[PDB]
Protein backbone atom coordinates (compact mmCIF):
# COMPACT_ATOMS: atom_id res chain seq x y z
CA UNK A 1 0.00 0.00 0.00
CA UNK A 2 1.13 3.61 -0.49
CA UNK A 3 2.58 5.75 2.30
CA UNK A 4 1.47 9.39 2.15
CA UNK A 5 4.03 11.78 0.65
CA UNK A 6 7.10 13.05 2.63
CA UNK A 7 7.40 16.64 3.86
CA UNK A 8 10.68 18.25 4.86
CA UNK A 9 11.36 21.46 6.78
CA UNK A 10 14.30 23.23 8.40
CA UNK A 11 14.10 23.67 12.14
CA UNK A 12 15.10 27.06 13.46
CA UNK A 13 16.90 26.72 16.79
CA UNK A 14 18.27 25.42 19.15
CA UNK A 15 21.68 27.00 19.06
CA UNK A 16 23.52 29.26 21.43
CA UNK A 17 24.11 32.69 20.00
CA UNK A 18 27.28 32.53 17.98
CA UNK A 19 30.16 34.88 17.05
CA UNK A 20 28.30 37.45 15.04
CA UNK A 21 24.88 36.42 13.77
CA UNK A 22 21.64 38.33 13.35
CA UNK A 23 19.91 38.12 16.73
CA UNK A 24 16.48 39.55 17.49
CA UNK A 25 15.10 40.26 20.96
CA UNK A 26 11.54 41.11 21.97
CA UNK A 27 9.86 42.77 24.94
CA UNK A 28 6.12 42.42 25.28
CA UNK A 29 3.86 44.37 27.65
CA UNK A 30 0.05 44.39 27.91
CA UNK A 31 -1.30 47.93 28.13
CA UNK A 32 -2.14 49.89 31.25
CA UNK A 33 -3.28 53.48 31.76
CA UNK A 34 -1.51 55.53 30.71
CA UNK A 35 0.09 53.40 27.93
CA UNK A 36 3.69 52.87 29.11
CA UNK A 37 6.89 53.39 27.16
CA UNK A 38 8.99 50.28 26.62
CA UNK A 39 12.76 50.59 26.29
CA UNK A 40 15.68 48.22 25.94
CA UNK A 41 18.69 48.90 28.17
CA UNK A 42 22.20 47.65 27.46
CA UNK A 43 24.65 48.57 30.24
CA UNK A 44 22.10 50.83 31.97
CA UNK A 45 21.87 53.14 28.96
CA UNK A 46 18.74 53.58 26.84
CA UNK A 47 19.24 51.87 23.49
CA UNK A 48 17.93 53.56 20.35
CA UNK A 49 14.93 51.41 19.47
CA UNK A 50 11.25 52.10 18.79
CA UNK A 51 8.29 50.62 20.66
CA UNK A 52 5.10 49.69 18.81
CA UNK A 53 1.64 49.52 20.37
CA UNK A 54 -1.29 47.76 18.76
CA UNK A 55 -4.43 49.81 19.41
CA UNK A 56 -6.76 46.83 19.00
CA UNK A 57 -4.84 44.46 21.30
CA UNK A 58 -3.49 47.08 23.74
CA UNK A 59 -0.21 45.15 23.67
CA UNK A 60 3.05 47.12 23.57
CA UNK A 61 5.96 45.31 21.92
CA UNK A 62 9.61 46.34 21.42
CA UNK A 63 11.66 44.47 18.81
CA UNK A 64 15.45 44.90 18.82
CA UNK A 65 17.71 43.28 16.22
CA UNK A 66 21.51 43.28 16.34
CA UNK A 67 24.54 41.19 15.36
CA UNK A 68 26.00 39.18 18.24
CA UNK A 69 29.41 40.16 19.64
CA UNK A 70 32.13 38.48 21.62
CA UNK A 71 33.12 41.74 23.39
CA UNK A 72 29.77 41.82 25.14
CA UNK A 73 26.67 39.68 24.79
CA UNK A 74 27.73 37.41 27.59
CA UNK A 75 26.02 40.16 29.58
CA UNK A 76 22.42 41.26 30.08
CA UNK A 77 19.86 43.32 28.12
CA UNK A 78 17.14 44.86 30.27
CA UNK A 79 13.62 46.00 29.45
CA UNK A 80 11.90 48.81 31.33
CA UNK A 81 8.30 49.97 31.61
CA UNK A 82 7.65 53.58 32.52
CA UNK A 83 4.67 55.31 34.19
CA UNK A 84 5.59 58.74 35.63
CA UNK A 85 6.73 58.58 39.27
CA UNK A 86 9.45 51.18 36.67
CA UNK A 87 8.65 47.56 35.81
CA UNK A 88 11.80 45.81 34.62
CA UNK A 89 12.90 42.46 33.16
CA UNK A 90 16.53 41.72 32.29
CA UNK A 91 18.06 39.04 30.06
CA UNK A 92 21.52 37.43 30.15
CA UNK A 93 22.72 36.08 26.80
CA UNK A 94 25.18 33.33 25.95
CA UNK A 95 27.37 33.81 22.89
CA UNK A 96 29.86 31.27 21.55
CA UNK A 97 33.03 32.70 20.05
CA UNK A 98 36.55 31.50 19.22
CA UNK A 99 39.66 32.49 21.21
CA UNK A 100 41.03 35.72 19.76
CA UNK A 101 44.71 34.91 20.33
CA UNK A 102 47.16 33.26 22.73
CA UNK A 103 50.06 34.48 24.87
CA UNK A 104 53.33 32.63 25.49
CA UNK A 105 55.63 33.16 28.49
CA UNK A 106 59.29 32.21 28.85
CA UNK A 107 62.96 32.94 28.23
CA UNK A 108 64.19 33.76 24.73
CA UNK A 109 67.57 32.32 25.66
CA UNK A 110 68.31 29.12 27.60
CA UNK A 111 71.60 27.48 28.61
CA UNK A 112 72.48 24.18 26.92
CA UNK A 113 71.76 21.11 29.04
CA UNK A 114 69.28 23.06 31.12
CA UNK A 115 65.53 22.67 30.80
CA UNK A 116 62.88 25.34 30.19
CA UNK A 117 59.24 25.90 31.19
CA UNK A 118 56.85 27.57 28.74
CA UNK A 119 53.42 28.91 29.72
CA UNK A 120 50.53 29.69 27.37
CA UNK A 121 47.34 31.55 28.19
CA UNK A 122 44.63 32.05 25.62
CA UNK A 123 42.44 35.11 25.27
CA UNK A 124 38.89 34.67 26.65
CA UNK A 125 36.63 32.37 24.63
CA UNK A 126 33.33 30.54 24.87
CA UNK A 127 33.33 27.78 25.42
CA UNK A 128 36.76 26.92 26.92
CA UNK A 129 39.57 26.33 24.46
CA UNK A 130 41.88 23.32 24.27
CA UNK A 131 45.56 24.20 24.37
CA UNK A 132 47.87 22.07 22.24
CA UNK A 133 51.60 22.30 21.69
CA UNK A 134 53.77 21.66 18.66
CA UNK A 135 57.55 21.51 19.13
CA UNK A 136 59.84 21.46 16.07
CA UNK A 137 56.98 20.45 13.80
CA UNK A 138 55.99 17.68 16.18
CA UNK A 139 52.74 17.59 18.13
CA UNK A 140 53.40 16.72 21.77
CA UNK A 141 51.25 14.95 24.39
CA UNK A 142 48.78 17.52 25.70
CA UNK A 143 49.52 18.78 29.24
CA UNK A 144 46.77 19.14 31.84
CA UNK A 145 45.28 22.64 31.57
CA UNK A 146 43.80 25.13 34.02
CA UNK A 147 40.62 26.96 32.99
CA UNK A 148 39.68 30.31 34.52
CA UNK A 149 36.35 32.12 34.40
CA UNK A 150 36.43 35.76 33.43
CA UNK A 151 33.71 38.20 32.48
CA UNK A 152 32.40 37.36 28.99
CA UNK A 153 34.36 34.12 28.59
CA UNK A 154 36.81 31.43 29.77
CA UNK A 155 40.63 31.47 29.82
CA UNK A 156 42.68 28.31 29.30
CA UNK A 157 46.25 28.02 30.54
CA UNK A 158 48.88 25.34 29.98
CA UNK A 159 52.51 24.80 30.98
CA UNK A 160 55.00 22.84 28.89
CA UNK A 161 58.58 21.83 29.63
CA UNK A 162 61.34 21.75 27.01
CA UNK A 163 64.63 20.06 27.87
CA UNK A 164 67.77 20.97 25.92
CA UNK A 165 69.53 17.94 27.40
CA UNK A 166 67.74 15.65 24.95
CA UNK A 167 68.75 17.90 22.04
CA UNK A 168 72.18 17.70 20.40
CA UNK A 169 75.05 20.05 21.22
CA UNK A 170 74.53 21.46 17.72
CA UNK A 171 70.92 22.50 18.44
CA UNK A 172 70.59 26.21 17.70
CA UNK A 173 67.03 27.02 18.70
CA UNK A 174 63.75 25.43 19.73
CA UNK A 175 60.43 26.32 18.09
CA UNK A 176 57.60 26.36 20.61
CA UNK A 177 54.14 26.65 19.09
CA UNK A 178 51.02 27.12 21.19
CA UNK A 179 47.44 26.68 19.98
CA UNK A 180 43.99 27.33 21.48
CA UNK A 181 40.94 25.66 19.94
CA UNK A 182 37.20 25.51 20.52
CA UNK A 183 34.23 24.58 18.24
CA UNK A 184 34.12 28.14 16.93
CA UNK A 185 37.75 28.42 15.88
CA UNK A 186 41.44 28.38 16.73
CA UNK A 187 44.44 30.70 16.99
CA UNK A 188 48.18 30.04 17.27
CA UNK A 189 51.38 31.87 18.22
CA UNK A 190 55.04 30.83 17.98
CA UNK A 191 57.84 31.72 20.41
CA UNK A 192 61.47 31.07 19.50
CA UNK A 193 63.98 30.08 22.19
CA UNK A 194 67.68 30.45 21.42
CA UNK A 195 70.22 28.13 23.04
CA UNK A 196 73.19 29.83 24.71
CA UNK A 197 76.41 28.29 26.04
C1 LIG B 1 18.83 41.23 10.55
O1 LIG B 1 17.42 41.08 10.62
C2 LIG B 1 16.74 42.35 10.69
C3 LIG B 1 15.27 42.05 10.89
O2 LIG B 1 15.07 41.09 11.91
C4 LIG B 1 17.02 43.16 9.42
O3 LIG B 1 16.44 44.45 9.57
C5 LIG B 1 18.52 43.30 9.18
O4 LIG B 1 18.76 43.90 7.91
C6 LIG B 1 19.20 41.93 9.25
N1 LIG B 1 20.65 42.08 9.12
C7 LIG B 1 21.44 41.16 8.55
C8 LIG B 1 22.90 41.50 8.50
O5 LIG B 1 21.01 40.11 8.10
C1 LIG C 1 9.11 58.14 31.17
O1 LIG C 1 7.88 58.12 30.46
C2 LIG C 1 7.45 59.32 29.81
C3 LIG C 1 6.09 59.01 29.22
O2 LIG C 1 5.64 57.72 29.61
C4 LIG C 1 8.49 59.70 28.78
O3 LIG C 1 8.08 60.88 28.09
C5 LIG C 1 9.81 59.93 29.49
O4 LIG C 1 10.82 60.26 28.54
C6 LIG C 1 10.25 58.68 30.26
N1 LIG C 1 11.44 58.97 31.04
C7 LIG C 1 12.46 58.12 31.20
C8 LIG C 1 13.60 58.61 32.04
O5 LIG C 1 12.46 57.01 30.68
C1 LIG D 1 52.87 27.14 35.35
O1 LIG D 1 54.00 27.95 35.66
C2 LIG D 1 53.68 29.10 36.46
C3 LIG D 1 54.95 29.92 36.60
O2 LIG D 1 55.17 30.73 35.45
C4 LIG D 1 53.10 28.66 37.80
O3 LIG D 1 52.76 29.80 38.59
C5 LIG D 1 51.88 27.78 37.57
O4 LIG D 1 51.39 27.28 38.81
C6 LIG D 1 52.23 26.62 36.65
N1 LIG D 1 51.05 25.81 36.37
C7 LIG D 1 51.11 24.50 36.08
C8 LIG D 1 49.79 23.83 35.82
O5 LIG D 1 52.17 23.89 36.03
Swiss-Prot record:
Disulfide linkage: 27-79, 120-178
Mutant phenotype after disruption: Animals are viable, fertile, egg-laying proficient and coordinated. Abnormal synaptic vesicle clustering in the HSNL motor neuron from larval stage L3 through to adulthood. Reduced accumulation of synaptic vesicle proteins snb-1 and cat-1 in HSNL motor neuron. Defective synapse specificity due to altered distribution of synapses. syg-1 is mis-localized and diffusely distributed on the axon of the HSNL neuron.
Q: In which tissues is it expressed?
A: Expressed in vulval epithelial cells.
Annotated coiled-coil segments of the chain: none
Where would I find glycosylation on this chain?
A: 22, 82, 159
Compartments where located: Cell membrane; Synapse
Q: Where is the Ig-like domain?
A: 6-92, 99-194
- Complexes and interactors: Interacts with syg-1.
| Domain note | The first five extracellular Ig-like domains are required for correct localization of syg-1.
Q: What does this protein do?
A: Cell adhesion protein. Determines synapse formation. Required for correct localization of syg-1 at synaptic sites.
Q: What is this protein's name?
A: Synaptogenesis protein syg-2
Query: Which organism does this record belong to?
Result: Caenorhabditis elegans
The organism's taxonomy opens as: Eukaryota, Metazoa, Ecdysozoa, Nematoda, Chromadorea
